Design a protein around this ligand. Sequence first.
Ligand SMILES: [Fe+3]
Length: 52
Amino acid sequence: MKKYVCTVCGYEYDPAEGDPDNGVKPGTSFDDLPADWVCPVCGAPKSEFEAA
Ligand SMILES: [Fe+3]
């Protein structure tokens, strides 16, 4: 349940919540996000998130 933060905009990916609108059910770890998933608030890539 390790949270990751977007270093572009500050959105925090929370595995307990997932990201339903992008096809990511609650409980999905950051490491298991789809290869094309991007920050839902700003569009930044996963390579620009850091552990938070
Ligand atoms: Fe972002």
